[PDB]
Amino acid sequence: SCYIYWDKIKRIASRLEGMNYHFDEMDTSGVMPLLDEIEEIAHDSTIDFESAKHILDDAEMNHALSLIRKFYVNLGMKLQMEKAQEVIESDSPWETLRSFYFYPRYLELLKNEAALGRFRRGERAVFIGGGPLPLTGILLSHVYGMRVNVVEIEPDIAELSRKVIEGLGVDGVNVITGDETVIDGLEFDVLMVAALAEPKRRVFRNIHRYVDTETRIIYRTYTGMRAILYAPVSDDDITGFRRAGVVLPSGKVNNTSVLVFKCP
């Protein structure tokens, strides 16, 4: 084909490639223009899902896509780490937390999800893939009055997260250090899977073994042009589950939210 977005993406990737050659370590302030250029493409409403995969999954875009998707994850992780450290240091922690680049977005995303998953105060939720800034976990308790365990595989990241939660004075959020297998030993009404929790195939196979058919499972994925940001969850990833609802994003939200139940 001949899409103008193909050259734009290749030029972005080239810039990312040159940057990474020079520095392993992300300069979070400096690369905010690159993120906004990438998000303008991802957010372009005038483009349907089929057209999105025609442009994105074209073989000649694979290298550029990989670089962009690596950027997004690395930037996200560094933004979370920096903000976590900021919150811990702050004498005004909630003010510092609301300044996080994605804060307004998670706010909208959760509201969407709570409707999709019928969240009720008092229910037990497990969130897989907390990261250093366990924003979803925190909101689930602070806003939705849920009883939350956040699971984090990396012990130092998990420790930082506990410090964030304590700095915010948020009750009812516990952090578990380990992989998604810790869910066998937990009771929960709802289970959420972070957008960047990996590997997807393994994570869904572990969910499948350790849940029953009545437990609500909500995962975060990417669709349409927003798949420039990250690889979506594949239908093969969700073998043995049935999709029972979706919330497609709008505005600046990047994630699609999917409700599934284990078969059968």
Place this chain on the structure above:
Amino acid sequence: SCYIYWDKIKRIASRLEGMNYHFDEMDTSGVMPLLDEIEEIAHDSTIDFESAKHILDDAEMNHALSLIRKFYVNLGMKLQMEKAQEVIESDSPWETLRSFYFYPRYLELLKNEAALGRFRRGERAVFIGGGPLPLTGILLSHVYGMRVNVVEIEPDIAELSRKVIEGLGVDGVNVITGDETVIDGLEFDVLMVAALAEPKRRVFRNIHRYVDTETRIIYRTYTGMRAILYAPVSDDDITGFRRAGVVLPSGKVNNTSVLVFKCP
């Protein structure tokens, strides 16, 4: 997975099996409940595009899918033939035309397409694959005041369509007997491709040779659960074209309309 639609589709297909390879022999009036059954499924808005794809792409669904598709194409063709003769014989041809089962649907589909393609009075349209009842051709003129050539490969079908057009007294619609290659000798502003024009690969490869980069080309295809009805136009078919816009259907409309331009 365990979608309820899976079993429902297999059940409907079981009742089509005994018509296999002789669907053209269908009783049109007596099979309408069967179309309603398939349509209840195609038009279900709660089924997301990923779920629809899980179903239609599964190897186990392949024979039931061919049975449903053979049923839908044969029913549509028979109805078209039956209505064309009915119009020709009618004292009230316009009213008879409007009693066509898909009439209300085509009217909305065209409405959508006219916005998408920016149709205007006096513009030159060519419609590939007229069939016996060239409704789109007739409406492009009768409603949109466009000047139309309808292309029909089968000489006896072309002859019948001309009778339908002459019976209605509609201006500015001519039928050319031939393949899509006849566009070589034509001048036009908008090219439309019928949902049923086949084989898509040969057709689009010929269209590519004869149009330019500013020709508006609209084709009809199937997306989501509506792809149960007929094989969608593939990525491979529209090589050398770029998508510029899409109208997704709602209500009982079956076709997705897609606007393309030749590269660049």
